[PDB]
Amino acid sequence: QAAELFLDTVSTFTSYELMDYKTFVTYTVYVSMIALERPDLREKVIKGAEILEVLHSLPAVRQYLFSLYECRYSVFFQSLAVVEQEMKKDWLFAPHYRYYVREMRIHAYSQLLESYRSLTLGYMAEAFGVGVEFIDQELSRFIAAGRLHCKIDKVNEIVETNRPDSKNWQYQETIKKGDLLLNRVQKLSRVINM
Amino acid sequence: AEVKGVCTEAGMYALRERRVHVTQEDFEMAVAKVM
Amino acid sequence: KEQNGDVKEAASILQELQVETYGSMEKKERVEFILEQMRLCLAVKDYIRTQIISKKINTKFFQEENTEKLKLKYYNLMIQLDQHEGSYLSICKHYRAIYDTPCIQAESEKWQQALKSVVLYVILAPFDNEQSDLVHRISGDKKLEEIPKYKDLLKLFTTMELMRWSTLVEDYGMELRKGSLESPATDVFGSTEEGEKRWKDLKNRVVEHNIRIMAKYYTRITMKRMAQLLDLSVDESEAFLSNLVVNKTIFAKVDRLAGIINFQRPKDPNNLLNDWSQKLNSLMSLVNKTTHLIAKEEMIHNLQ
Amino acid sequence: MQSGIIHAAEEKDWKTAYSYFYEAFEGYDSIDSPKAITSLKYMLLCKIMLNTPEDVQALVSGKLALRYAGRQTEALKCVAQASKNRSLADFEKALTDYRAELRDDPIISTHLAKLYDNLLEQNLIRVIEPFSRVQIEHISSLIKLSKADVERKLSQMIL
């Protein structure tokens, strides 16, 4: 929703009481990267005239966004490190910088893995500039978390992707949200009945 | 009243050029049309 | 002007006339004027003008007696226009209309040739509901009996089974494209550029029929066999199938790596359970029918 | 006409540019100048760039556009046919035929790149449609392009 509102109000921003247009576009670009899919990102951020002009003014966040978009990897990671530092410094993004970095790393891994049935951990590490052991541990952690649609064969390092139907994801989300709401409903029931 | 008409016609020009935001060009054309 | 050449100016002279509006002029002369317009337009090779002019004739007029030469000329011009365009269904319809002419009906050879053209063009027409209905009616035609071979060709193209183009050519080719001095062979496939095009189109129709039959009968097939049955190499066969798939005439997924083609769409749970429920409904209906038969037989064989 | 040029020279919206070109054509319709032919040319270019090439044939066949048949409108007719066929080879053939007409920088040479990109994407879609598993070398042989280039384009389309 932050990205949705920011993209709606990117061309009509006047609330300088809160923050400058440079910072506004920076936040908009960050939220758009972490929220929007590739087509929406292309249509809105990568081609919006105002966003492009303000990103021409900004030397760093423009590089970050475009590296993510056009798959220049490991430069996406230096960009993510610097943006993480400034996110931690910022009061607004501070208690979400870890989550944002984790989500952006997951997005980059998913983007790299989507268009390939298999991809060696060596190739992954070469693309991301990181070491094979580090990328292996990161990828395994994210797969265990369940946010990447692949598995990794370790005896002969190779990452093999798969395509689980969206019905499984929707069922898991339905169970989770229904459990939250059912716990709330049950709490209300105990509060009222007695 | 003419100023309000200028604003309304600027909106109408933004409509004619199918678009979501009224712009300086729309306001210019609205002033020209109203006066 | 035309006798002096300069056909374009004579054409122009004619289409300056809006003969469809003249009220005093008799209907026969109006139709003759329109046909002359169409003839000179065709000579000028202005097919769009010829078509729009043709749209000014009510075919109902070719029914109130004395309309034989008029209708024959009209339908021959329509055949010429549709041939120069590329259609075959309209050519078949116009040839059938000519066949329905008493003048062609007599002079046996005339209706021989007319019915041969009708059959050939209904075969050449790409498959659809209209073409299927037309071939149904043409096969139902009784006078096909006189012509031995064209009835058999219609039977082969209306049968729900394969047919090799090699044997098709061997059995029929010599007496459709040429030959048959005793019974003149039509010009639908004559040795002229347009006849070559029509022959290639007939080959395409044969391949389309084979692909349709394989699609409806096969759950799965290999290209090495599909090409063999289509009398094409693997490359031409798969290109033809790709053209059909892109046009959405026939669905087929081609696994090139395994050299496989499957005509079955991916299984949908809705479709599977719908088929199961339809089977159950048919089963219930059939048990009701069979118990009614039980009752009938018991009535007949129980009292005495 | 100038507004229709500046729009679609700055890219963004093509429907507004098409409307501007239609109004310019109505104005230039032999009433006050002979530039109706070039206005119609730009109009057809906008219509094809809108990923709606079927409309070009009707646009040129319209009663008012019928009297403008020539090497400037038939070229856009061929380009629209190529776009409908999703055949990059046919598009290249049309360009080779009408080179000077379609490439002497009449404010369309800046859009031939976009035409090439989108038509290449459409041709790849068409060639891969009748397949469940095909060789990239086979796709290259069918679309007349290098294996690495088609691989990169296919990866981009997948993403």
Q: Tokens in use for C47?
A: 């097919």
Q: How far is A115 from chain D (nearest CA, A)?
A: 6
- What are C's interface residues with D at a Cβ cutoff of 8 A? 241-242, 245-246, 252-258, 262
For D155, nearest residue in chain A (alpha carbons): A115
Distance between CA atoms of D18 and D24, rounded to whole angstroms?
10
C-alpha distances in Å from residue C151, one per residue of A2, C14, C106, C115: 74, 43, 20, 10
For B18, nearest residue in chain D (alpha carbons): D16
Residue C232: strand, helix, or coil: coil
Would the CB atoms of D159 and A38 count as touching at under 8 Å?
Answer: yes
**Chains D and B are touching, with contact defined as 3 or more CB–CB pairs separated by less than 8 Å:** yes
Contact D16, D51 (CB under 8 A): no
Distance between CA atoms of A104 and D151, rounded to whole angstroms?
26
**Chains B and C are touching, with contact defined as 3 or more CB–CB pairs separated by less than 8 Å:** no
Residue type present at position C29: E
Residue type present at position C98: I
**How many CB contacts within 8 angstroms connect chain B with chain D?**
5
**Torsion over CA: C197, C199, C202, C208 (sign):** negative
Distance between CA atoms of C143 and A82, rounded to whole angstroms?
89
Residue C85, class by beta-carbon neighbours within 10 Å (0-12 exposed, 13-18 middle, 19+ buried)?
middle
Chain D residues in contact with A38 (beta carbon < 8 A): 159
Dump the DSSP string for D21-73: HHHHHHHTSSSS-STHHHHHHHHHHHHHHTT-THHHHHHHHSHHHHTT-STTH
Best A41, A73, A107, A115 member to test D by mutation, with max D CBs in 10 Å, is: A115
For D19, nearest residue in chain B (alpha carbons): B17
Q: Tokens in use for C25?
A: 């002029």
Question: Other CB atoms closer than 10 Å to residue A60's CB: what's the count?
Answer: 14
Strand C260-262 and strand C221-222: the pairing is: antiparallel
Contact D21, D41 (CB under 8 A): no
Question: C201: Cβ–Cβ under 8 A, 6 or more apart, which residues?
Answer: C88, C124
Residue type present at position D104: D
Residues listed for chain B? 35
H or E segment to which residue A3 belongs: helix A2-8
Backbone angles phi, psi at A121, to 5 degrees: -55, -30
C-alpha distances in Å from residue C195, one per residue of B12, C188, C199, C209: 62, 6, 6, 21
Place of tokens 């309309």: C67
Would the CB atoms of A115 and D12 count as touching at under 8 Å?
Answer: no
Residue D2's Cβ-side half-sphere holds a number of Cα atoms within 13 Å equal to 0
Question: Other CB atoms closer than 10 Å to residue C205's CB: what's the count?
Answer: 19
Distance between CA atoms of C43 and C45, rounded to whole angstroms?
5
Distance between CA atoms of A140 and D139, rounded to whole angstroms?
35
Chain B residues in contact with D13 (beta carbon < 8 A): 18-19
Distance between CA atoms of A157 and C86, rounded to whole angstroms?
60
Residue type present at position C58: N
Chain C residues in contact with D87 (beta carbon < 8 A): none
Residue D135: strand, helix, or coil: coil
Would the CB atoms of B17 and D16 count as touching at under 8 Å?
Answer: yes
C-alpha distances in Å from residue D85, one per residue of C159, C192, C237, D80: 33, 29, 20, 9
C192 DSSP 8-state letter: S
Chain D residues in contact with C262 (beta carbon < 8 A): 132
**How many CB contacts within 8 angstroms connect chain C with chain D?**
30
Residue A16: strand, helix, or coil: coil
Residue type present at position C112: Q
Q: How far is D20 from chain B (nearest CA, A)?
A: 10
Three-class SS of A50-94: HHHHHHHHCCHHHHHHHHHHHCCCCHHHHHHHHHHHHHHHCCCCH
Question: D46: Cβ–Cβ under 8 A, 6 or more apart, which residues?
Answer: D4, D8, D14, D17, D18, D21
Place of tokens 């021959």: C76
Q: Which of C241, C257, C258 sits opposite D130 (nearest CB)?
A: C241
Experimental method: cryo-EM
Q: How far is D19 from chain C (nearest CA, A)?
A: 29
Chain D residues in contact with C256 (beta carbon < 8 A): 131, 133-135, 138
Q: How far is D6 from chain B (nearest CA, A)?
A: 14
> Which is nearest to C100 in space by CA: C86, C114, C120, C81?
C114
Chain D residues in contact with C242 (beta carbon < 8 A): 127, 129-130
